[PDB]
């Protein structure tokens, strides 16, 4: 025999055959029975509409098969192919090492977001639809693992993550839209020495002095405020506490916490609210 | 150091822009200027009178002062959050007014006394003395008031016990300034689309941004998806993003709220929930009532995935010394489970018998029982009888048990007890072997690294890896600071400890003296001459105490050496140039220095790793207590544990100890915390194989001989290395040395891979300077104080004939100040 | 007779796209600004539903809340 | 031989292919309009041009033969493997019903489409057959709310394990 | 004011299979220590009233609770198609005395909830049952009956809000699916997301319906140490207590998050696991602490014992007394459990990003219209 269903090419519990040796899942077989045929099986060994209905009645004696599609309907859109047991696969998403330092085109490999290499956080990722690298820790959902090295990956900086699904007839062309405003669509668009080295050195020196003066003036204005920064930012919690303990309804940030409390106990609009201290017996 | 300066400046900026309070400034600075106690002590002059750093032991322990307490340095990057503080205040006043309900005048005195402090009329230390007076009987309240004080604010990324959060947090994306780039970068119609094409230089990254804008135009996405999907396009330009946030009228206190929700999804259920068919949503659970169908999810299922490892729990491989404690545990379980089951059954049947034999004697003879006697758990009773009683013959023994449970009950109790004693006898005689396998495999099961580090570290100490890392660090700094990167110093090492710096060289030449019987007329010439050229050593105490190695006193004593006093003397004090083979030595040497420094700092907790194995009195019933200091060979007799580990490394080097004995020695003392010494033999082999390269190979011997001969003259060195080009095949580095801080430093300068260069000029003509950065500074100040400088001249290249074509009428003219 | 909703790819020009975007976003921004201004002056009835509907950041919530909490308090 | 298919039907066929052979979804087999109502609904709309009598007889013959024939291929070759299990259950809930009374036109266009292949064993009748095949196709696509479903059903959790998942 | 402890002595004698990782043995080991430490004079030990067939159908389907009741290992060809519809048979196997085990676990936790509901216990323990994988219509990952989703419903009768924290190494997914659309039970779980068992538990799985933003998932990487865990654990639970404001907690203290586990990936220790219990205990809410995972039985037996004495308010010495399984406890016969030196994979970047995202989702009830 052969160890694959003679209809769907699948593994599992086979009803084999004695005379015409094939295999059927016994529900991929002829009219499904349920299972359980221990004796010999012998699975199907044995000019007008008149002759065409004789074709209809002659289709009986030929050992059922799965349905796939014709060659014209499956091979019609872009990036659509069948599997090996006739299932739908995407042939445009096919074909990992965590620490990469330089590409084979001899360029640095630095994250696109923080600009640092695969040494700050142990691993980097390379896009298959771009020339950009990312740290899984920088994407915003952060990848806890890494994808497989057989399916392609797509960095955050594409619009394919927002264009819904359209499939292309695989022999369409690109229509050059000459219409210089107001064109409607839904995302299916393509788009149409001095040899001065002394001047460069002087440039760089004066730019550096510019930067130094900039931060030298920043620290002049910042460092004279420390005395009030410290005071307010460090006595804040006691001022909040003095407002709450005295029940200052004018502190417009107190009543917003009180509204959080009304919004947690899921207040019913029918009862009257309680005094601001008595709502605080939600907390304890 | 460009990163440290830029980080300081960004934290000062963020304090000014109010992204960061005074706590955030203080703590991020503490984390930036930690190696620079001179700078922290300098900064202390500006800080307010009560908020100053408190450095101790030259800067190994500092704790900022506050108004009421002091507080020690932790780091998580906290921010501020006002709702949390209002909720804590509400809760605390709740509890306080609930504790003092008896007399309504000690919450009055807490009300009209925080008010005074709020105006100005109290102080921290004046208010606190009344708060600690009222909350005197309640010691759990006065301990929550200490969270509303200036000290709990500073390092507060960890909430106390029974308290809501103290601060807020956010990510930082590896910035030395722990400041999120969602608040830094985000706090004309020809001005926007001109720039975006400069920033987005890749022409298929620009197109992908125009398509985002287009599907905004068409109606597919809203404003928020547009402003949150575009952050990851143009945010590394604090002007482009701030422009875009006004071109769409989106204020930055709203982009923060909407950023997370609006870059992706399979939303409103997430990647792993499916809606059930309407037919299934009605399968009936007969015990629920009104309430539980109107609480339990019936609509949405999630179900057990496969991304290759998720149906059934089938976890990864383990070390061969955890496949032997699992097996031991399984054997013990088999024996114990059979014994305990049979004992349960014996006890239960005895209880049944003591109720059948507590009746008058006339009914005992046929007092009957059901199939499982009365036991609510007859599975145990069934399985034990099927096991003991030869299952093919257990059936009748069930039957006889149910009809005459006054004749069969003792007859089967006795048989169960006999079989039980047999099992216990077999068990007691195998516990020796269990203990003896447990004593082997236990220690290297809390130590996974004795298997994996042996290859991880092998990839660490390569040449190709270390060179690739130098190159990527160069190209990473050539992008954050395009102006202040020519003062690069990729790697800056600080060799402050000379008692470890002597031991590193000691070990690297002690390896060579024994393992390779050649050189030693050049391997000592290296260590005596070349290393003090780079490293700023005394060169006379060094080459005295370094001859405790080259001539013997070893292998019979093999002690820890005597050290010189002040091996180090006290801008770049010495610069040299060298190719890759010397860079690799300076990399391996620092690896070894860091290893021995870690090892020397370990020995302070070696007193609490030895308390975890203090005897257990109850195990002094003569079971194992097989003490671990009996498989240890002769332990050295030096002062402290670092010297003993050093003697043991020397024994491993000399061949008087193999790896197993050495690792067992390490595990006894330091626990699993000394696992980078396990491969310290191949490290020293690598360093000693480099030192044997700077001295031979017929190509690098010439470079080192030149370095030595023009060392007697700074100008001669940097001219022959940098403006005359003897280069064989390599990269060019420049190693510096700063005595006052003992800092080393490496920096790429060139390559050596084209070149039939001779020279433009005559190096005698430009002779002034000492260093090379002073040469560059002199050129700069000769250009700034110039008397004329014109650069009109331009040209163009001839395609496939790479000559210059100077376009006419264009000229260049410089004139120096002294000419006129 | 219905046909495919996406039959081909279209080439576009960058400048017509840019002028389209600037027009659309100017319209939306003009809309949102007057929405902001009208929200700025609302009343949020005083004693109305507890656990109010508005967002937390609403310039007139903290007077509704103030007057109803001063209602309930004595 | 070859028939022409409205590109809307190619898109729909490939969507069904992916939806069942990859996303594990099902058509809710008891069909509100079945394969038997959807042939009478075509006959009673096409009969308005039944002028000549020989054409009336050929049309009647073709329609009857093709309904009874679709009943002889719904078990053989109009199902993907992931659709065999759902077959058994209905064959056990409706024991002796004709199949061209439960299944619908989602499964019937699969038979129209797959018939330059099955026709290889040729004077006139094949042409008049394929003609009504094409007119039926474009008569179905015009009535996209009369002969087609509004959702594919989620294959139950217990269902997946019985077929090979 | 005395921690009510639930133990039925018959539990240790149930046995899954030949070398199955799950050993109910370990609840017996625990009690041994608990009984020799002079602990059980401080607790309030109670034998659970076993759960009937009518309780377990308050969350499971009748054709399932009535299949576990009748299947046996001998007559398992008369139920041969029923062990695919229900998932029993090969990984959640058929063993001698299955339904009595389910009765024991379920009745213990339902009794704990009943004990809390009346003002008699403020904490209530049950190590026999914390089975958090069991689905309403089938068995999943060594669990058959979901006892937590039966104690939660009984808790949801005097308490408005109820919180379920899950510190197993696996995702507690049945308890999340049972409560995925309700704003009354918030299910928080710290798990190892990756190519790991349940397959579920993304950070984006966060509720539906009226219970949207009420499911919290914290996906970690393997090797997390005791300090990284505390950094990611303490603020999340403090924020949940500030916003959700629960009324009673159900802590599931699974122990494959510990070092040296035959199925876990984490790297915690006895103190690194006890800081969670100690922190959640500090809020003064009625708690129920139940068992869970844990497949290296010598470490489980000692950690659950330490925590039993921790909740009870007592201090246990570091040396194990004389007990009936002392030779399990290795050399040195100590109470502690120590960590590997295995490498951590959770950077501070990862942990800060996911923590701030969770707090974003948690704040979104008063920060939204
Ligand atoms: K929920
Ligand atoms: K968990
Ligand atoms: Zn098949
Ligand atoms: Zn990054
Ligand atoms: Zn990309
Ligand atoms: Zn688990």
Author numbering:
A (entry chain G): 262 to 307, 333 to 381, 394 to 490, 515 to 606
B (entry chain A): 53 to 126, 131 to 243, 256 to 621, 708 to 724, 738 to 879, 886 to 926, 958 to 1024
C (entry chain F): 331 to 404
D (entry chain D): 170 to 290, 294 to 337
E (entry chain B): 6 to 374
Report text from the authors:
Cryo-EM analysis finally yielded a reconstruction of SIN3L at an average resolution of 3.2 Å from the Pst3-Flag yeast strain and a map of the SIN3S at 2.9 Å resolution from the Pst2-Flag yeast strain. The PAH1/2/3 of Pst2 respectively stabilizes Cph2_α4, Cph2_α5, or Cph1_α4 in the rear side of the deacetylase activity center, constructing the scaffold to bridge the Pst2 Lobe and the HB1/2 modules. In addition, the Cph1_β3 forms a β-sheet with the Cph2_β5–6, and the Cph1_α5 interacts with the Cph2_α6–7, forming two junctions to further stabilize the whole complex. The HB1 and HB2 of the SIN3S complex may offer two binding sites for the adjacent nucleosomes with H3K36me3 markers.
The switch-independent 3 (SIN3)/histone deacetylase (HDAC) complexes are chromatin modifiers that catalyze local histone deacetylation and regulate global gene expression. The highly conserved, multidomain-containing protein Sin3 is thought to provide a platform for the assembly of HDACs and non-catalytic subunits, forming two major types of the SIN3/HDAC complexes (SIN3L and SIN3S). The histone deacetylase Clr6 belongs to the zinc-dependent class I HDAC family, which serves as the catalytic subunits of multiple transcriptional regulatory complexes, such as SIN3, NuRD, CoREST, SMRT/NCoR and MiDAC. In each lobe, the Sin3 isoform (Pst1, Pst2, or Pst3) wraps up Clr6 through its HID and binds to the Prw1 through its HCR.
